[PDB]
Structure 1
Amino acid sequence: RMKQLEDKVEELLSKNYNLENEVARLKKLVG
């Protein structure tokens, strides 16, 4: 369960980097 929690942190960080990359692409379209 240490490892499962660590795995979930790594997974959520990857998801937020994808969301960050998407926000930047959309902001480039608006801006």
Structure 2
Amino acid sequence: MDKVEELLSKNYHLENEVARLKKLVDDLEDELYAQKLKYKAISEELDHALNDMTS
């Protein structure tokens, strides 16, 4: 029928969205952790900075 026609259509668009969101969510997960490691490393040279500047 037609209620089936539109449902197939709506489900097609929905499945695509879900695909794009899952990938986006993964990309952000990585970007965010990469971010945290870059932040943690930014301090590593710093721990040696104020630490070696003190004594």
* TM-score, scaled to structure 2: 0.42
How many equivalent pairs are there? 25
Flag structure 1 segments of 5+ consecutive residues without an equivalent: 1-6
Indicate the percent of aligned positions where both proteins have the same amino acid.
Answer: 92
* TM-score, scaled to structure 1: 0.67
Distance (whole Å) between structure 2 residues aligned to residue 28 and residue 16 of structure 1: 18
Bigger Rg over Cα: 2
Distance (whole Å) between structure 2 residues aligned to residue 10 and residue 28 of structure 1: 28
Give 4+ residue runs of structure 1 displaced > 4 Å after superposition.
Answer: none
Distance (whole Å) between structure 1 residues aligned to residue 6 and residue 18 of structure 2: 19
CA RMSD of aligned residues (A): 8.8
